[PDB]
UniProtKB/Swiss-Prot annotation, chain A:
The lineage of its organism: Viruses, Duplodnaviria, Heunggongvirae, Uroviricota, Caudoviricetes. Belongs to the Teseptimavirus DNA helicase/primase family. Signal peptide: none annotated. Its cofactor is Mg(2+). This is DNA helicase/primase. Mg(2+) 1 binds at E94, D144.
C-alpha cells in the first residue's frame, strides 16, 4: 500500500514559527504547516486536505533539501484549498512556503493556496480545479519570477476560467524572497489590483491600423507574376507575399525547371531577392543551372561549352551579369527545425522575399519517428507559419506519389488534390497549388499542361495554359494551345 | 423569458432566417460547403453586418489568413 499519512503526535509535532522565512507560528498553524521529528531527524510537514477537511496527503521536508510525500497526492492537490470555499479573490502561489507568506502579510484573512506539484504541473493541477477556482471572482497567479515560472503562469491561465486570471509581478524570484527582508509592500500592491494579462494573440481591430496601412503599401494584389504562362497569372493573380505556393507534378524535372525559371525572373527582371534551398543538388550545381538558364544554354550538360566560357572570359562575365546584384542566395547543405531556422535567416537577415524550397519530400534529421505521412504535415505548418508570420513568399516544390491506377505520370495522367501527397497539411496549408502535367510518350512529349489545383486568393482554378520544353535552351517556353 | 427567439439574423438571404430563426447565443452554427470561398465570404459578410448594423461585438479567428489580411 501507499505511504501512511503522518500522525501529529505519533511524529513529535509542534506548530512552530518558521524563523528562517518570516512566517509566524500562528500562521503555520492555520495553513497546516507543522514541524515533526521521526526516528531522530526533524521534518517540515505540509498538510494537504481536500475541500471536505480530511487530510489526504502530506509533503514532508528534511533540512538538506529532500522530500517524502505521504498519503495519496492526487493530480488536483492544492495546499490551503480546504481553507476557502468562495471569495472575491484567491492568490495562487508556486510553493507551500510562498503560500505561508501571503497568508501573513494578510493576517491569514484572505485566500491563498499553493500548487500541489507546482513548478511543472501547473497546467494539470490547475485544470483539475476549474470548479474550485471559479468559486472566486479573480484568480491571482503569483508564480516564480523566472524562465519556467513565467511559463507556468502561461500554461496555467490557459486552462483556468475565463477573464479572471491576473499575473503577479514581484521584484524577486518568489513572494517569500520579497518578504525575507525586502518589499512586503510590493507583494501587497499585487494581491490587491495587480496585472490582469492574458491576451498574447488576441488583437483588437482598432489596434491594427498601423500594421494594416504598412501592409497595404508593402504587399501587392498582383504580387509577383509567374513567368512563362500568363494563365498561371490570370488565374492566381500571382504569388502574394506570406502565401505558400506549391508546385507539384509527376516525374517533372519540368517541375524543377519551372521553379528555377521563376527564381530566375523574380531575381533579375523583378528586383526581388530570391533565396533557394535546393535540397536535392549542390550549391555550385544549382548556381550553374541558373547561369546556363539565364543564358539560354544547357551549361552543365556540355563539356565543350564549359571549357569554352572558362577560357574566353565569358564565365566571369555571365556570372557577374546574373549574380552581381546580391539578389540570389542559397542554402547549401550536407533537421526540420535546423532547416526552418536557416530559411528564416534568409528571410530575416539577408531579407529575400521569395524562398524556394525544392522538394519537401526530403524531411531530414531527428531519426526515431514514424510516418513521413504525419511528419510531412508537421513541417508543412512550421512553413506556412514562417510564410504568413513573415510575409516571405514561400514556393515549395513537391513530388507525386504513384497511382496504382492504369496510366502513369509520363502517360500524362492529370492530377487532383486527392491525387495529392502528404496526409492533408499541404492539401490545406498551401495557398496556391500549381501542378504541371507532361505526357512524355505521346503527341507532344515536350508539351506540358498547367492545372491550378487551388488558389485561396482567387479560387479561380483549373487548366491555366501550356508550355513547351525546349530541350535545346533548357526553358519552359510559353505555348499556343487549347481545345 | 431568458432565452430567445429571433437571435441575430443571417444576412443576405431571408430564408436562412425564415428556417433557422437566426443564430441564438450558446448555439453552434456550422457553415460548410465544397470549394466555397463563397463559404468564406458568406461568413465574412455575416461578421460584417453583425458588428456594424447590429451592435454585436464580433471575434474572428480566421486561421487561414493573416490578421491584417482579414481586416482588409
Amino acid at each position: 500500500m501507499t505511504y501512511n499519512v503522518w500522525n501529529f503526535g505519533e511524529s513529535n509535532g509542534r506548530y512552530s514559527a518558521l524563523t528562517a522565512r518570516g512566517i509566524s507560528k500562528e500562521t503555520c498553524q492555520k495553513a497546516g504547516y507543522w514541524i515533526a521529528k521521526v526516528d531522530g531527524v526533524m521534518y517540515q510537514v505540509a498538510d494537504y486536505r481536500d475541500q471536505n477537511g480530511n487530510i489526504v496527503s502530506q509533503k514532508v521536508r528534511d533540512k538538506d533539501k529532500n522530500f517524502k510525500t505521504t498519503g495519496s497526492h492526487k493530480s488536483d492537490a492544492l495546499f490551503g484549498k480546504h481553507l476557502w470555499n468562495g471569495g472575491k479573490k484567491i492568490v495562487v502561489t508556486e510553493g507551500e512556503i510562498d503560500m505561508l507568506t501571503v497568508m501573513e502579510l494578510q493576517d491569514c484573512k484572505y485566500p491563498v493556496v499553493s500548487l500541489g506539484h507546482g513548478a511543472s504541473a501547473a497546467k494539470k493541477t490547475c485544470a483539475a480545479n476549474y470548479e474550485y477556482f471559479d468559486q472566486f471572482e479573480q484568480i491571482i497567479l503569483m508564480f516564480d519570477m523566472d524562465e519556467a515560472g513565467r511559463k507556468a503562469v502561461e500554461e496555467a491561465a490557459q486552462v483556468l476560467p475565463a477573464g479572471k486570471v491576473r499575473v503577479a509581478v514581484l521584484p524577486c524570484k518568489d513572494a517569500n524572497e520579497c518578504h525575507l527582508n525586502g518589499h512586503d509592500r510590493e507583494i501587497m500592491e499585487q494581491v490587491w489590483n495587480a496585472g490582469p494579462w492574458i491576451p498574447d494573440g488576441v488583437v483588437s481591430a482598432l489596434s491594427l491600423r498601423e500594421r494594416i496601412r504598412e501592409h497595404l503599401s508593402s504587399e501587392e494584389s498582383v504580387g509577383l507574376l509567374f513567368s512563362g504562362c500568363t494563365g498561371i497569372n490570370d488565374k492566381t493573380l500571382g504569388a502574394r507575399g506570406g502565401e505558400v505556393i506549391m508546385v507539384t507534378s509527376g516525374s517533372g524535372m519540368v517541375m524543377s525547371t519551372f521553379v528555377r525559371q521563376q527564381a530566375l525572373q523574380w531575381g533579375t527582371a523583378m528586383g526581388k531577392k530570391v533565396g533557394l534551398a535546393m535540397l536535392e543538388e549542390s550549391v555550385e550545381e544549382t548556381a550553374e543551372d541558373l547561369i546556363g538558364l539565364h543564358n539560354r544554354v544547357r551549361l552543365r550538360q556540355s563539356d565543350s561549352l564549359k571549357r569554352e566560357i572558362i577560357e574566353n572570359g565569358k564565365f566571369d562575365q555571365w556570372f557577374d551579369e546574373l549574380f552581381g546584384n546580391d539578389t540570389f542566395h542559397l542554402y547549401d547543405s550536407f533537421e526540420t527545425d535546423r532547416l526552418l531556422a536557416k530559411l528564416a535567416y534568409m528571410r530575416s537577415g539577408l531579407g529575400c522575399d521569395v524562398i524556394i524550397l525544392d522538394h519537401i519530400s526530403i524531411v531530414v534529421s531527428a531519426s526515431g519517428e514514424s510516418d513521413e505521412r504525419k511528419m510531412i504535415d508537421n513541417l508543412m505548418t512550421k512553413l506556412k507559419g514562417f510564410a504568413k508570420s513573415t510575409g516571405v513568399v514561400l514556393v515549395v516544390i513537391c513530388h507525386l506519389k504513384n497511382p496504382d491506377k492504369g496510366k502513369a505520370h509520363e502517360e500524362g495522367r492529370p492530377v487532383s488534390i486527392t491525387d495529392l501527397r502528404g496526409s492533408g497539411a499541404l492539401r490545406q496549408l498551401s495557398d496556391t497549388i500549381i501542378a504541371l502535367e507532361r505526357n512524355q510518350q505521346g503527341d507532344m512529349p515536350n508539351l506540358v499542361l498547367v492545372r491550378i489545383l487551388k488558389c485561396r486568393f482567387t479560387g479561380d482554378t483549373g487548366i491555366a495554359g501550356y508550355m513547351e520544353y525546349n530541350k535545346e535552351t533548357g526553358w519552359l517556353e510559353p505555348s499556343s494551345y487549347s481545345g
